[PDB]
């Protein structure tokens, strides 16, 4: 979510309000493992 509360209605399209990355072709993960 982020620090955002006005969730009901967005005036501008997502690709104008934010960037999106282009196509090429809680419960926490541990940062380290042992073998």
């Amino acid at each position: 979510r982020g620090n955002n509360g006005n969730m009901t209605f967005n005036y501008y399209a997502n690709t104008y309000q934010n960037s999106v990355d282009f196509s090429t072709s809680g419960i926490l993960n541990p940062l380290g493992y042992l073998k």
């Binding site: 282009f22 196509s23 090429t24 072709s25």
Partner: protein
């Protein structure tokens, strides 16, 4: 790969044509004509009317002409001189001399990417005062129209006729801004970026189109002619091209190597 450039057609190749590789994935579309030209840029700087204007005469203008230069702005990407359409762009390199310094304008951003022969769009016009806290208003009249150059009397105050009319008038607040979008109003189908014809059959100038414009705008104070001071005030003009379409691929201006 082998080709013949004399064909006039050359296939756009890739890395995999001769060598080992693949296509670079697309990631942008900003070269789209509707996206590129849809941004505002400075057209011209005009003086503000405080009285009923006398519209600038057609060329060649002779000595002693009583007229108000510098108040009217053609909505053209094309070059202008003295609020009338021009072929060559002109500028002044030195102050010294005698005579009137004519106003000239260009959209440098347009010709930096035209790159085409014909253009048509709607035109968002935005008017910004260069003087702080100015109360001003914008008057527009379309292509083929003209300025109504007279005044009428109310309570012994001369009220010019350009305060009214059937064409749009937009009153800004004190320190406010004016913004509105204009349709393609010409008799012509499109605007010629470059032109080879002639408008008249006699004494016309080759390459000067008559109606390659979205009309003319002017700035005026919403006060009668009796209220005047000597201090001249200035107004900047911004234009934005809406739903831009282009035809007939052509050249970009020469870049000097000096």
């Amino acid at each position: 790969s082998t080709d013949n450039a004399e064909t006039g057609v050359i296939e756009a190749g890739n890395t995999d044509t001769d060598f080992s590789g693949e296509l670079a994935a697309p990631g942008s579309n900003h070269t789209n004509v509707k996206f590129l030209f849809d941004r505002s840029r400075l057209l011209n700087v005009i003086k503000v009317l405080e009285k009923d204007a006398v519209f600038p005469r057609p060329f060649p203008t002779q000595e002693g002409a009583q007229q108000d230069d510098g108040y009217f702005c053609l909505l053209t990407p094309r070059p202008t001189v003295a609020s009338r359409p021009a072929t060559r762009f002109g500028l002044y390199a030195n102050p010294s001399g005698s005579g009137v310094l004519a106003n000239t304008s260009l959209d440098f951003n347009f010709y930096s990417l035209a790159c085409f022969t014909y253009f048509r769009s709607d035109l968002e016009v935005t008017v910004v005062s260069l003087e702080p806290d100015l109360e001003f208003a914008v008057g527009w009249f379309p292509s083929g129209s003209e300025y109504q150059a007279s005044s009428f009397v109310y309570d012994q105050l001369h009220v010019p006729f350009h305060f009214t009319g059937r064409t749009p008038r937009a009153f800004a607040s004190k320190g406010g801004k004016v913004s509105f979008v204009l349709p393609w109003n010409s008799v012509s189908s499109v605007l010629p970026v470059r032109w080879g014809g002639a408008s008249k059959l006699s004494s016309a100038t080759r390459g000067l189109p008559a109606h390659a414009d979205w009309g003319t705008i002017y700035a005026f104070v919403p006060r009668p002619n009796e209220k005047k001071s000597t201090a001249v005030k200035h107004v900047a003009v911004y234009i934005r091209y809406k739903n831009a379409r282009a035809w007939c691929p052509s050249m970009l201006p020469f870049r000097s190597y000096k």
